[PDB]
Scaffold this active site. Structure first.
Site, PDB file in Angstrom:
ATOM      1  N   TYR A  11       4.160 -58.814  16.876  1.00  0.00           N
ATOM      2  CA  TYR A  11       4.367 -57.578  17.614  1.00  0.00           C
ATOM      3  C   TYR A  11       3.259 -56.607  17.236  1.00  0.00           C
ATOM      4  O   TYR A  11       2.915 -56.476  16.059  1.00  0.00           O
ATOM      5  CB  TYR A  11       5.731 -56.958  17.306  1.00  0.00           C
ATOM      6  CG  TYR A  11       5.968 -55.636  18.006  1.00  0.00           C
ATOM      7  CD1 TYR A  11       5.515 -54.442  17.455  1.00  0.00           C
ATOM      8  CD2 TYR A  11       6.646 -55.580  19.216  1.00  0.00           C
ATOM      9  CE1 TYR A  11       5.727 -53.233  18.090  1.00  0.00           C
ATOM     10  CE2 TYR A  11       6.864 -54.374  19.858  1.00  0.00           C
ATOM     11  CZ  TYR A  11       6.402 -53.205  19.290  1.00  0.00           C
ATOM     12  OH  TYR A  11       6.615 -52.004  19.924  1.00  0.00           O
TER      13      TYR A  11
ATOM     14  N   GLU B  56       2.090 -51.559  24.284  1.00  0.00           N
ATOM     15  CA  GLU B  56       2.935 -52.492  23.548  1.00  0.00           C
ATOM     16  C   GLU B  56       2.595 -53.917  23.960  1.00  0.00           C
ATOM     17  O   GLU B  56       2.633 -54.251  25.151  1.00  0.00           O
ATOM     18  CB  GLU B  56       4.417 -52.202  23.793  1.00  0.00           C
ATOM     19  CG  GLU B  56       5.360 -53.196  23.123  1.00  0.00           C
ATOM     20  CD  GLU B  56       6.818 -52.794  23.247  1.00  0.00           C
ATOM     21  OE1 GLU B  56       7.432 -52.447  22.218  1.00  0.00           O
ATOM     22  OE2 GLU B  56       7.346 -52.809  24.378  1.00  0.00           O
TER      23      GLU B  56
END
Ligand SMILES: Nc1ncnc2c1ncn2[C@@H]1O[C@H](COP(=O)(O)OP(=O)(O)O)[C@@H](O)[C@H]1O
Ligand SMILES: Nc1ncnc2c1ncn2[C@@H]1O[C@H](COP(=O)(O)OP(=O)(O)O)[C@@H](O)[C@H]1O
Ligand SMILES: [Cl-]
Ligand SMILES: [Mg+2]
Ligand SMILES: [Mg+2]
Lengths: 228, 228
Positions: B119, B203
């Site tokens: 991530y 993101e």
């Protein structure tokens, strides 16, 4: 005889596997093909193949040196450089002589791991009056120095190739596992092209064993030439 | 907030690597995309990703039974089947509830070996009044159960990220060799997107380590979301 791109698409039309890539008539277009392919398999390399009506491209040379009609490229810009030195210029190989044949298009393909390269052709044998499958994993040289290395499978023109002949041929070429049946299905497809197109030769040089992007081993035509 | 395809293309515009695939608004088109990709990487498999403004597609389910908004396909026909059950149908995830969000397009991608999934997000941190890079190799759960697993790199909005900060981050995530600089360059691209687009969040979930068709390891954004 129809060009590389067209034969491969014909082979895939009939259920065979072939790397037809995409043809470009300019270095800008060659680059765009590569950039778009990076959307699907990011980081992949590319192969640029001069589309010229002449054999033995892999070991020719161009005006500015270069050498080879089939070259690896790491990026779309490297594709542009190579393509720009092929399109509109003259390649020199054994089959051309000092003349050199002009090139106005290239084939841009994704680079793949090639594990094995075979020769396989389906010929109309006038003497016997039937089709004959000619294959080897080693074409005129191999037949003379090692005729046993060459396999010739006469085909029944009414029944076509039998699964027995094709399975044996596949194993005779050194294939194992799922590649045996894979090879049968591809050879069956090549025969339908040979038959349904009234061809006198379907020549696959090389018929290769390649890896998919996820490491599966599959049979694939890396070159194709169909004569009528 | 802009969709997956648009963010990925934007990321690659600035020098990052992302698998943007190709979007289709019908199962017929999805199939054609897969068929044409078989010209470049014969035998490859495909991934079909429902393009919906909603997260958690991988673990969702469709009203008429099918599981997952991201599904593997072996052939163009399997791509058609999957796409046909996504386009014009209703997906149900955690972020949607029993209502279910409608899907009118999918992304068709080549299947690749995914070695690692990270991530990584670039956030406008209001508290600190600066951008901060947030990454982990394990998002709200991980931060609570293992706060040490989460790395936060405050960014000087005048100097941008330093190679020192980015190199350290890459090694903190466990990268070595060419993947370290590969990760630095991709994170530099993500920041330029963050900056030049006046974003509040870029993101990448997951930022992956994938293999190219010829087994090279490269960093690639497998998902992307940019908020404004
Ligand atoms: N996708 C590819 N990836 C890697 N090498 C390739 C690819 N396609 C072709 N080649 C290589 O290019 C060589 C030359 O191809 P070919 O079309 O047979 O030209 P030639 O007329 O020189 O034999 C092949 O022997 C093979 O090793
Ligand atoms: N090209 C691909 N090949 C193989 N697996 C993939 C590919 N693209 C995505 N995936 C898998 O799909 C999963 C879900 O993808 P993603 O776009 O992140 O959806 P979401 O996070 O909303 O579930 C990823 O975690 C990854 O494992
Ligand atoms: Cl359409
Ligand atoms: Mg050849
Ligand atoms: Mg995601």
């Amino acid at each position: 005889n129809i060009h590389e791109w067209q034969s491969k698409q014909l082979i895939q039309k009939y259920g065979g596997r072939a790397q037809s890539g995409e043809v470009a008539f300019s270095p800008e277009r060659s680059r765009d093909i590569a950039k778009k392919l990076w959307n699907q398999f990011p980081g992949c390399k590319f192969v640029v193949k001069a589309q010229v009506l002449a054999g033995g491209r892999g070991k020719g040379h161009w005006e500015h040196g270069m050498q080879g009609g089939v070259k690896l490229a790491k990026t779309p810009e490297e594709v542009y450089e190579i393509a720009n030195e092929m399109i509109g210029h003259k390649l020199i190989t054994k089959q051309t002589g000092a003349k050199g044949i002009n090139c106005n298009k290239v084939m841009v393909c994704g680079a793949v791991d090639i594990l094995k390269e075979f020769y396989l052709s389906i010929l109309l044998d006038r003497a016997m009056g039937c089709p004959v499958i000619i294959a080897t994993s080693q074409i005129e040289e191999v037949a003379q120095k090692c005729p046993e290395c060459l396999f010739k499978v006469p085909i029944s023109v009414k029944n076509g190739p039998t699964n027995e002949q094709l399975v044996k041929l596949a194993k005779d070429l050194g294939l194992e596992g799922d590649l045996v049946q894979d090879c049968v299905d591809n050879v069956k497809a090549l025969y339908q092209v040979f038959d349904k197109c009234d061809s006198t030769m379907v020549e696959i040089n090389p018929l290769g064993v390649i890896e998919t992007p996820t490491d599966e081993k599959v049979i694939c035509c890396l070159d194709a030439k169909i004569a009528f």
